[PDB]
Ligand binder design. Sequence first.
Ligand SMILES: NC(=O)c1ccc[n+]([C@@H]2O[C@H](COP(=O)([O-])OP(=O)(O)OC[C@H]3O[C@@H](n4cnc5c(N)ncnc54)[C@H](O)[C@@H]3O)[C@@H](O)[C@H]2O)c1
Ligand SMILES: NC(=O)c1ccc[n+]([C@@H]2O[C@H](COP(=O)([O-])OP(=O)(O)OC[C@H]3O[C@@H](n4cnc5c(N)ncnc54)[C@H](O)[C@@H]3O)[C@@H](O)[C@H]2O)c1
Ligand SMILES: NC(=O)c1ccc[n+]([C@@H]2O[C@H](COP(=O)([O-])OP(=O)(O)OC[C@H]3O[C@@H](n4cnc5c(N)ncnc54)[C@H](O)[C@@H]3O)[C@@H](O)[C@H]2O)c1
Ligand SMILES: NC(=O)c1ccc[n+]([C@@H]2O[C@H](COP(=O)([O-])OP(=O)(O)OC[C@H]3O[C@@H](n4cnc5c(N)ncnc54)[C@H](O)[C@@H]3O)[C@@H](O)[C@H]2O)c1
Lengths: 466, 465, 466, 465
Amino acid sequence: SVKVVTDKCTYKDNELLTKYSYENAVVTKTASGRFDVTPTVQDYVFKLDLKKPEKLGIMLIGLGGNNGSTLVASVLANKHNVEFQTKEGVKQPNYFGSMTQCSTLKLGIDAEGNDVYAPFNSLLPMVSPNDFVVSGWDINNADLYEAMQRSQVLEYDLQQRLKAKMSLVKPLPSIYYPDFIAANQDERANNCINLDEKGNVTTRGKWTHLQRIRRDIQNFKEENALDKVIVLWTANTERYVEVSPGVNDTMENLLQSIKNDHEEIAPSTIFAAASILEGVPYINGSPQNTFVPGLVQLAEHEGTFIAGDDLKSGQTKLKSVLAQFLVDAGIKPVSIASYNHGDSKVAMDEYYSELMLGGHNRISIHNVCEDSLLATPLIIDLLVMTEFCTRVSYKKVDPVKEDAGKFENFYPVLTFLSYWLKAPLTRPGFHPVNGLNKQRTALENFLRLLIGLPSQNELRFEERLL
Amino acid sequence: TSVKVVTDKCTYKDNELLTKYSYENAVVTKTASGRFDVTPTVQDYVFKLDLKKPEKLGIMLIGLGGNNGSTLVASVLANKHNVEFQTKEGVKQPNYFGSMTQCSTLKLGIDAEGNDVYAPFNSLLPMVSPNDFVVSGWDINNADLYEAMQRSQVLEYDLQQRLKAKMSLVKPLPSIYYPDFIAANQDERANNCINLDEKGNVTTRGKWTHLQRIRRDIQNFKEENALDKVIVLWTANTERYVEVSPGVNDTMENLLQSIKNDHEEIAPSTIFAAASILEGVPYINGSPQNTFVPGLVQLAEHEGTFIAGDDLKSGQTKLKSVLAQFLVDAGIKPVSIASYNHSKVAMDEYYSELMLGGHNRISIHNVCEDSLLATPLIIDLLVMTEFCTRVSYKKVDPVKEDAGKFENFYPVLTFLSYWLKAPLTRPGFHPVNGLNKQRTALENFLRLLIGLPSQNELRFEERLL
Amino acid sequence: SVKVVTDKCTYKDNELLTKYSYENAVVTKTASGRFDVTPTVQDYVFKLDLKKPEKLGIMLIGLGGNNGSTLVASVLANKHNVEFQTKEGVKQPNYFGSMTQCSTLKLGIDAEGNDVYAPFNSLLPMVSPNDFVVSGWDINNADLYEAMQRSQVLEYDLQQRLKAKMSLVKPLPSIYYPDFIAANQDERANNCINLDEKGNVTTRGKWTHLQRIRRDIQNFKEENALDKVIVLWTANTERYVEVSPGVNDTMENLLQSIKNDHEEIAPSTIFAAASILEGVPYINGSPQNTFVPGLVQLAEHEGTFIAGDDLKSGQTKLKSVLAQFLVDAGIKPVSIASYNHGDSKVAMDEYYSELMLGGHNRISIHNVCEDSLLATPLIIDLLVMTEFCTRVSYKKVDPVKEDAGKFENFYPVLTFLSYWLKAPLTRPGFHPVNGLNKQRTALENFLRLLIGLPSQNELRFEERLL
Amino acid sequence: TSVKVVTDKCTYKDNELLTKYSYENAVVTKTASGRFDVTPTVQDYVFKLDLKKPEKLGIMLIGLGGNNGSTLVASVLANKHNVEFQTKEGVKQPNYFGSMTQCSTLKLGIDAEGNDVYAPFNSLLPMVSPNDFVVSGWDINNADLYEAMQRSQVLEYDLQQRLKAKMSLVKPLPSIYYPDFIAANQDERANNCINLDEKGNVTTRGKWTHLQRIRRDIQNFKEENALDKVIVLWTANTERYVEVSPGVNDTMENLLQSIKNDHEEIAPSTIFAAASILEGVPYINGSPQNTFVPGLVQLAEHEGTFIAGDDLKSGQTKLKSVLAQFLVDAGIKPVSIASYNHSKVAMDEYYSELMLGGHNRISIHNVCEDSLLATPLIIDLLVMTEFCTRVSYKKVDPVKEDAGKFENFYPVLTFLSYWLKAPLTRPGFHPVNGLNKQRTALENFLRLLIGLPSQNELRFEERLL
Ligand SMILES: NC(=O)c1ccc[n+]([C@@H]2O[C@H](COP(=O)([O-])OP(=O)(O)OC[C@H]3O[C@@H](n4cnc5c(N)ncnc54)[C@H](O)[C@@H]3O)[C@@H](O)[C@H]2O)c1
Ligand SMILES: NC(=O)c1ccc[n+]([C@@H]2O[C@H](COP(=O)([O-])OP(=O)(O)OC[C@H]3O[C@@H](n4cnc5c(N)ncnc54)[C@H](O)[C@@H]3O)[C@@H](O)[C@H]2O)c1
Ligand SMILES: NC(=O)c1ccc[n+]([C@@H]2O[C@H](COP(=O)([O-])OP(=O)(O)OC[C@H]3O[C@@H](n4cnc5c(N)ncnc54)[C@H](O)[C@@H]3O)[C@@H](O)[C@H]2O)c1
Ligand SMILES: NC(=O)c1ccc[n+]([C@@H]2O[C@H](COP(=O)([O-])OP(=O)(O)OC[C@H]3O[C@@H](n4cnc5c(N)ncnc54)[C@H](O)[C@@H]3O)[C@@H](O)[C@H]2O)c1
């Protein structure tokens, strides 16, 4: 734990109230060249619900896949201390690869002026992956032990020690329309709600599917005595949907198209619409425009969290880091080749860059690891961060009128999660932000701010000029 | 390209800028158990930034005839005269690619729809461009720079030919040669030394006279070229480390004595360094090795002369550190990092532990003639230590303050840490390193200087209602 | 030069006559397991025309491409000693990358028993690349200097020193049918014979095209006072052709389809048919079935050399070497990934192989170089070897009837060149042979044999048992 | 799987095969200028191949408790008992992958339509399978093989558990420990040594008695297990080279003396070697280092005992050599070859010159636990030196001959050169190396043995009319 001697924070009824001065700057560029930078300010009073649910309910769509199954296993492994045998000895479970669970943040310096970091989840209170209550859907009924089997991600022994328990977790029938599977459809569709009472699939009753899914969420909520719940798409990858004026452009139409069983309405569209109606945060972990404007509207209306559009591969991450550092130092990357072979894949991206005076630079990144062992911890983080956000709200403080604010909620598309997605969906007029490093500080500073610490600046003036 | 920020923390006398900045930080004290107590600290300053930048800057390179050196001189003339050159891939315009000061940009703020607005790194305040450099220097080998550029087979053939007329005119000054000190990094023979005895043969006797010639040398260069501001940078061999002792190189009085006693522990490096200090020309040691022993540092603190320190980041070590960092910022536990090193080639193998017995292996293979990397880095280094020389700071206590009298940066330019592998320092402070962070320093200091907050990445305008 | 004290070789009228005992073995496999190996023998009298043309005429189709232009330049560079300046100093021309010009062969041992090799072209007399007289076609009229320019393969300076001369080499109009360009069509078709007298291309007059091409070869032959000529396809890569019963299955039909301007008749088909009619060796350096059965028939009839089906990339070569060595040692390659970005390309093939006891082996090959600098010397070799073959003929000697042989010519599809092609076309009932190493020895032994030396055996008994 | 070639160069007495072979070769003498004069040479032999192969072969490993050793013993039992094991990728049948004798094939001839016919490498003649091995050995560490296999974290966990009952029963014999000789390769402490003085502490005194215990040890193993044929292979540490001198290890008389004088230059290796010779058991040195000094070689020539020599090819050095060779067989001029080396990882960078100033860069990155590579290689080594032990040759002069009396192979099994990085030899002959070639030797010798020509790749049946 950490606590800061500051006057900008007061603990109410198990609620942190923080005043933050939001400095920024507007700049215009003159039809000549010159940039005119007009600074900016806007104080805020942030309210952090200080009580983390004791048990967070999670509902994975594609719960039978490599990521879903290893997610459940990672929770069971850590919660129950189930150590497993390995070719390299006996090993304790952990959560390596997770930012919430294993990375740290700088708090400040010490007597001698040397940096001092603390667990990324030590500052403010966050829910533990170990307190996750998972279940979900999957268009295939294998159970999670059998799921762990076909994925071949975990160690034989480990898989064995979780068998008894994971043979018990059974995914619910999901909704499966055939024309939308654009890929990542490893298993057969033998567990579906959507069956014309004869036995077939069919794309009819799309609204009834939505209701079924909504009811699903409600029942799951009670069977576990859970208040907060969070759904997340980790299934196959579908075909993008053609947003057309009248079907999925505005709220009114989206819902409407569903009842009509419009064809542009896809499985994820429903799970998303359902999640939203139940006011439960929905995360799109796969590439695809499930979040058409129409659905987005709905979210804005219900005032319920959404995020997503691809889990950030540990390769598409490392590609960002590398390419940025490059431009940041003045090199002009002029070419970018590729590789890529779930579990145990090989990635290789090569950069042919320009140096000064006709020179060139050839950089090659070779990457091998089991995908899911990276995608899973990253899923843990998303869930853990959209949980914390859901408990934060802010207030716009007017400098010449004490206490002029009615506490509001994070604009719906939590862009704060971007660090973990490839295509950061975004508010209507903004250009998305990538660049792992920037995306992380944003999060680090947000957390600094809530406990009253300033934006990290690294100027370290207590040495650069004594 | 110019930048004008509408603030009030900035007052412009005339060719003298005063800026008010509030340095927020924190001290923490974890104690008994796992609880960190942070006490935020503030300390106000007023930064004076002398707006007058030298129209011509003198750059004196030790190792002028080597790979870095010849290509430095080459890129100056080539960029300055827009001398295009032919290649198999077509005609090519010279540039300064690989220079942070010259080719990278910065985010100042946003615009009408939220999208960031970037601007040239050298646009903000006012900096000396490399095109207006005038360079000379020393080297233990007399070959002029057409030949040197010829040896250092780094530049395209045609380009070396369009530059032959001008580069031939440049010849390094005789240097100081103490054979036992040359650990490594000398690809060329020594036929240009000032330390010749009363018989013409390389001596280690008379080091103080060697020190004087270097000053005479520094003085002459400024005189013969107008130039008032001049900076020396060692880019020569890498000598064998010197052993730090008492009564020799510990103080500022017996380092001057030691030199006079022709005592050992005084490497060519030491002399050049001290000579640079004694003339108020900041000195940059771009190669690994002590040099900046304790004694020397004093001499520079006194006299008020800046000094940048120890070695200069490779374009793979400045990629190793960021690759490793990225990993550790995602919760991955590197277990092993192995490094190749060699156009030349570098390889780094990272085996880091994943979750539940899983493992990940990343392989970074890097290829390029690193002088095209080291050179733009040398420029940056020079431009930046120049800027830092027109900036004095004022430590203010808001309810009194420091009743006027600015201070130059603590001699050691630990701002230049983005360009040196072994960031020099002053006692007790654990060296930093952290490219991303280190660069974030220069951006923030370039910002506050003109009244800018120091960037956060919260985008409340977008994430907040 | 080399000369061997042996009784199996006699020099006639500037003609080597060699007796060779061709040992081999037939084996059947019993419906049980056992292999019954019935050895074999068949003596031969080989006749080698000992006089190499003073000037060999070469006609490249795609003479304007990266390979064609750098081929001409490599000949001009070496013949005229034109040294060029480089970033690394002044360099003399050479023929690195060529087996005929730069590799060696073991002849035998010495006083102390240490191996002794000799230039691969020192044994018997072969024509020098420096004595090549090149010209050819290209569906684009840039001249070869301009050709050298757009390819960017050679050093600026070198390109400059060959400018005067190469601005003089101008490719002839070629035949260009649009529907056959499946790829590698970097330049525009502005130099074609096939133009309906109006100005367009059209696919009519296919036979007249053949005649034009034949006449082309004849004129080239005389304008240079050349006897021997060799055409080679080094142009774009076309669409495979559908061999159908009646158009290109037998000779009679092929020729026929041409007159008919059948659509299955493609540009390479004609250059090939023409080459054959003129009895000049035709080499197919690109992937594509230009050699349909019908064309093959024709070759068999005229008794004229053919070979080809892709130039062997220095990567598809290195892939063979590696994969073989692997199986040869018992490893079971189970996977093979890929890369590939002419000039300056990057290849990367990765092998995931199985070791004993569930173990695995991960091998990755990364390759970067300018393609053409490898493809060109390899083109030199093909030309140099199909030239030598063209001067060899053999005789079947019957062991119980002195001198029963009428000297014959190499079966038409010189499979001896395979070492340099990817898809080694082959005689009707045989399964092609790859495996660079085997493919090379075959050539080494053939040459050994002609000068009377036995098949290399490496048993080195003068030490393994004294 | 059996092979029966219809020839007449092969006569089968009964469990004794005689083969007639004509060894064609050539001597050449380049002289004045560039002209090679080759004079073809012939020398006829009769090869006797004792058809009786041991039903059980004793394998004594020095270093039995190490990585190679435990996995050797493991693969024997696992293959022999068809003990399948579980993995994340499913249940897996044990095998002998990586063994040339066990899993690679050969071309004997063609068939009805020209297409080659391949057959198992161990099908031709008759060889001892690894499944019928009986292994014991020494190691300076007493840990039994369940534990050893446990340390050497090379085998899958489940597989180590299905083999725990049997591997626990096996414990290495006490070895010989001379601390100063251990250059490197000892990952484990020494708590199992026979060279303890009259007080129980490791001595270097009494080397001859150490030599005797090794024989007693060899004798016992054969007795206690029936076995008549037994082969020892050093797969222990790699010791510091020994210095060759006069009156100590030069002859066969003062190497026996030296040992008795407890003289130095006698490494544990030397003793094991000599002990193996003195019992007629062939000895295989699978690690770099002299050992096979000159003296020792004599002792083995005498006594008629085979000896395989120096180190054992890595699965990357046995890929470096072939990669380089391939390049040089295409006319490319390697200029630089750089080697990494580390499951473990290896990297090789080849920069070779192309035509007209062009350059090519090949990068070979290799990964795998190399014991799964070294182990099958050890098997092969053993199977093959066994075969070579049932083959005597007869040097015949066709118009007289050698009026009967075969000869064993010259002690040094330079046939095993495909498996050893530093192919040992006898004076004057420049070491060979050339994987492809070296393997082509074994194929040709396996061929002639049964009356086959020795393969050419001319395919006159296809290329000839
Ligand atoms: N960034 C990374 O490193 C990384 C790695 C692996 C997967 N991913 C992402 O995760 C997704 C797949 O994850 P995975 O590794 O478990 O793959 P997977 O191949 O196991 O597929 C996920 C599971 O989803 C189920 N599914 C498919 N369609 C469904 C539907 N309409 N409704 C409910 N369940 C459905 C499948 O049966 C399967 O078991 C992909 O979208 C992919 O982009 C990212
Ligand atoms: N660590 C890095 O990434 C990095 C990158 C670039 C340069 N450097 C530093 O730059 C220096 C040389 O680098 P380079 O690429 O130009 O190599 P280089 O091969 O051109 O050698 C430097 C030049 O200095 C001259 N010289 C040698 N000893 C001298 C002496 N005692 N006094 C004066 N001149 C001397 C040489 O003749 C040569 O021309 C070294 O100090 C090196 O450590 C380090
Ligand atoms: N193995 C290797 O490393 C390697 C490398 C490069 C090219 N190749 C082979 O060579 C061929 C192309 O060679 P390149 O490197 O010169 O490429 P390129 O891109 O320069 O194309 C060859 C030339 O052929 C000409 N051409 C195209 N179609 C023609 C036609 N119908 N008639 C006459 N000329 C025609 C083009 O205009 C071009 O200039 C391809 O088939 C390719 O497979 C192999
Ligand atoms: N060059 C190669 O590619 C290659 C490949 C495989 C093995 N080798 C050789 O095999 C040996 C070990 O290889 P490994 O992979 O099994 O390693 P390892 O780490 O298992 O060590 C060998 C074993 O020998 C034992 N040992 C050490 N010193 C000894 C001594 N003086 N007398 C008896 N036993 C002793 C050790 O305790 C250990 O169990 C070395 O000699 C090595 O050079 C070389």
